[PDB]
Design an enzyme around this catalytic site. Structure first.
Site, PDB file in Angstrom:
ATOM      1  N   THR A  84      -5.192  -8.397   9.882  1.00 27.15           N
ATOM      2  CA  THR A  84      -5.455  -7.162   9.148  1.00 27.15           C
ATOM      3  C   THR A  84      -5.307  -5.961  10.066  1.00 27.15           C
ATOM      4  OG1 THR A  84      -6.914  -8.350   7.626  1.00 27.15           O
ATOM      5  CG2 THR A  84      -7.057  -5.952   7.604  1.00 27.15           C
ATOM      6  N   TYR A 122     -11.841  -1.247  -4.487  1.00 23.37           N
ATOM      7  CA  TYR A 122     -12.668  -1.252  -3.277  1.00 23.37           C
ATOM      8  C   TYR A 122     -14.187  -1.346  -3.552  1.00 23.37           C
ATOM      9  CZ  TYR A 122      -8.656  -0.372  -0.294  1.00 23.37           C
ATOM     10  OH  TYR A 122      -7.458  -0.528   0.420  1.00 23.37           O
ATOM     11  N   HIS A 156      -1.631  -5.496   1.389  1.00 21.44           N
ATOM     12  CA  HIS A 156      -2.936  -6.178   1.220  1.00 21.44           C
ATOM     13  C   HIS A 156      -2.636  -7.529   0.620  1.00 21.44           C
ATOM     14  CE1 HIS A 156      -6.860  -7.227  -0.669  1.00 21.44           C
ATOM     15  NE2 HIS A 156      -6.099  -7.615  -1.677  1.00 21.44           N
ATOM     16  N   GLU A 193      -8.953 -10.123  -8.154  1.00 21.95           N
ATOM     17  CA  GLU A 193      -7.928  -9.108  -7.950  1.00 21.95           C
ATOM     18  C   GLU A 193      -6.837  -9.144  -9.015  1.00 21.95           C
ATOM     19  OE1 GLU A 193      -6.870  -9.479  -3.717  1.00 21.95           O
ATOM     20  OE2 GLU A 193      -8.858  -8.787  -3.118  1.00 21.95           O
ATOM     21  N   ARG A 230      -1.787 -14.673   3.530  1.00 23.78           N
ATOM     22  CA  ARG A 230      -2.446 -14.012   4.640  1.00 23.78           C
ATOM     23  C   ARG A 230      -1.701 -14.272   5.939  1.00 23.78           C
ATOM     24  NH1 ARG A 230      -6.696  -9.997   4.151  1.00 23.78           N
ATOM     25  NH2 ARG A 230      -5.119  -9.384   5.736  1.00 23.78           N
ATOM     26  N   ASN A 284      -1.723  -0.188   7.210  1.00 22.26           N
ATOM     27  CA  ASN A 284      -1.336  -1.546   7.558  1.00 22.26           C
ATOM     28  C   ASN A 284      -0.436  -2.156   6.490  1.00 22.26           C
ATOM     29  OD1 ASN A 284      -3.224  -2.149   5.549  1.00 22.26           O
ATOM     30  ND2 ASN A 284      -4.388  -3.602   6.866  1.00 22.26           N
ATOM     31  N   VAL A 312      -4.776   0.182  11.525  1.00 19.04           N
ATOM     32  CA  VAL A 312      -5.412  -0.554  10.430  1.00 19.04           C
ATOM     33  C   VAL A 312      -5.425   0.232   9.123  1.00 19.04           C
ATOM     34  CG1 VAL A 312      -7.682   0.003  11.360  1.00 19.04           C
ATOM     35  CG2 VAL A 312      -7.489  -1.744   9.595  1.00 19.04           C
ATOM     36  N   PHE A 343     -16.806   5.497   4.901  1.00 21.31           N
ATOM     37  CA  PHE A 343     -15.344   5.687   4.765  1.00 21.31           C
ATOM     38  C   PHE A 343     -14.771   5.397   3.371  1.00 21.31           C
ATOM     39  CE2 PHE A 343     -16.160   1.401   6.417  1.00 21.31           C
ATOM     40  CZ  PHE A 343     -15.458   0.598   5.518  1.00 21.31           C
ATOM     41  N   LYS A 352       0.843  -1.198   0.000  1.00 18.89           N
ATOM     42  CA  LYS A 352       0.000   0.000   0.000  1.00 18.89           C
ATOM     43  C   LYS A 352       0.879   1.249   0.000  1.00 18.89           C
ATOM     44  CE  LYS A 352      -4.157  -1.198   2.147  1.00 18.89           C
ATOM     45  NZ  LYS A 352      -4.743  -1.101   3.498  1.00 18.89           N
TER      46      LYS A 352
END
Lengths: 151, 150, 151, 151, 150, 151
Positions: free
Chosen positions: A93, A51, A117, A128, A87, A114, A111, A59, A11
């Site tokens: 997360t 998203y 992803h 994805e 993961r 973080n 978070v 948000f 990210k």
């Protein structure tokens, strides 16, 4: 089973903090095979599409703005159990719940910051990967170590 | 947010050359170092440190050991730093600690468990006041604050 | 007891993937004392003796063939709680269950390629040490750091 | 002499970039003994006193402003040849000349952002130690490893 | 090509917990481990090891020290491994060694310089025969050989 | 001066040996800014074009075949002195001459398997970047750490 792929994205905060190589190295050491890679700053539309599942949330605009605020690094990894292993390598997360030894456990606090992803399931990973990468961007190759890593 | 915790590298952690390793793990996590020092605790500082244990067995031996050589005292600042600090150090008893934590990677015996971290905000505030004067605590802003914290 | 000992082996995949030093360094950093060390390729017979508790299992022949396929590094480590701590350092025997921070969590994917072995109990350790090493191959020495690691 | 001491400081950029632990760990791994340690933001006056040998140079005012802009970590390390070995560990003072493997070689690009400082001689070290630390801030202790590091 | 070198971690390198670090640096470089053992040298092995120095000052002290605790003996195989091994270890005198090498990173004093590597192919062949029987040397092929070697 | 860019490529052997993350991390830690990244298997024509300057050499066909034999990772890094710093980080082209602490010094033995390529000059870097990347593949962003790394 060993054809399985997952999508991992560093990210904007992970890229800003110089954690791209660290993350890649952790997947390589685990025995996973890198098959797609790129750096880019998402456009607003790319961030919205990524998203999509959250587009009804209050948000969402903030998330979209943050995710499109600077470069991310997109990756696809291949190998047996890679979605679940990805993961596990990233950690919980929410970094408050992540264990030292994982990426969030070692590097993250919040978070919303973080670091990375990873796909949550094989079905999400297919979506994805296809969202971020065209077919001709995915390299097909065989690791010389495959018989050392896999039964 | 401006939450702070106290971390000490105990005499065995200093003797085993682990001070830099422990500092680096807090820095990597995104926490902010605001106070730092090395000293050998006097008998009185060690008794003060262990005041809660003064009625427990072998208190004089604990006091003697903690005052036997240098420790490194630190204060770290950041959101959830007290809880995160304890998680980074690992279980107090090394036999229960997980690899990836300081005790998990480097310790075997509770009696030589390398480091100490405050167990609560209240304890942290007490320990920080015990070991540092106000003017030894640095006030600064990390250039990375907006990358680490929401 | 401070004189407890365990047997650790880097399996043929761990040797092939260049993980010997990494494994040894993690045991040294933890404070354990190396007392025996060698590299050899197990014969079929040695592999069968090693896995003798598994001689009725359908996966026994494959385990034996793999263990005898190339060099292993055999070790004995000494110290308080070394058997249990050894197992914890190596991680869950099935890498799918192993946590990052452990050898299998960081490096392994498949259970038939799980990089290393550690004795599962003090009883097993005594058997494995005696199987792989003669008494005169075990070094008796005192670490200068013993009073820093143990009270 | 085994009791030689040097002054090392992590400069404000090294503290900002989270290099304090990395620097300390490299001196510990080398076998040197930490005897003094503190964090503080230098006043203008302290920065001018620190760089007093450079008071006639055109870059002096910029060096002083930068050194007093944020916290530094001050240290004293003890051991045989610690002044020269300290300089070697930090690397060439201009990072363009520094070799990978050294602190500046691994982490620095610009000479005004060269991460750290080490005394350039025993004479300079004695001055710098006395400038930054009172006698009662210096810990006298014996490393358990001294006979393993020094003959 | 099938060139081999002998590397020993000396008693101080074993005491300081550096065996794994040294092995890892050779593995990372792409060299192949073919023999490995830990032992405390007898007086006779130490005299043999230092035979070239038997007429130099303080030979009995060197013999006593080298036989005082365990060493780790290794044999590594690969193109230019004798020269590359010495480069990896760094200058024999740690004051001249460069950070990034074993002595550069971990040693201060020539008397405690952590490790030894053969200085030539001829010396390597002598040292390997001295410390290992033929049947202790493993014959195997690295799966990565074609990635490392032309 | 800080707009300078260099091209770095992890060669097929570097990708096969799991060194991509290690290399990226070394540039990030040095303070350089990643602005383009991709993984691909060069075609014969791409390999020929990359090695254009060598097209008259007897070893050209072998080089082309090796370079197109599997995936490489292409990167562009930005910052002051990055071309020279990149070559210093990689080490001597011939690994027999490379110093420990550099990529070739730590990981490589043979010149034909020397893990990574970096541009030899600013002029070569401009050519290499434009050869491997289109303009729209290069990310324009500002590191939050820029004032910590650069004067």
């Amino acid at each position: 089973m060993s054809s399985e792929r997952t999508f991992i994205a560093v990210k904007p905060d992970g890229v800003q903090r110089g954690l791209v190589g660290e993350i890649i190295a952790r997947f390589e050491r685990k025995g996973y095979k890198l098959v797609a890679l790129k750096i880019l700053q998402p456009t607003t539309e790319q961030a919205q599409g990524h998203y999509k599942d959250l587009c009804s949330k209050p948000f969402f605009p903030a998330l979209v703005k943050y995710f499109s605020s600077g470069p991310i690094v997109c990756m696809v990894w291949e190998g047996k159990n890679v979605v679940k292993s990805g993961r596990v390598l990233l950690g919980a997360t929410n970094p408050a719940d992540s264990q030292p030894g994982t990426i969030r456990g070692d590097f993250a606090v919040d978070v919303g910051r973080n670091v990375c992803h990873g796909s949550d399931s094989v079905e999400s990973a297919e979506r994805e990967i296809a969202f971020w990468f065209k077919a001709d961007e995915i390299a097909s190759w065989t690791s010389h170590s495959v018989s050392q890593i896999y039964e």
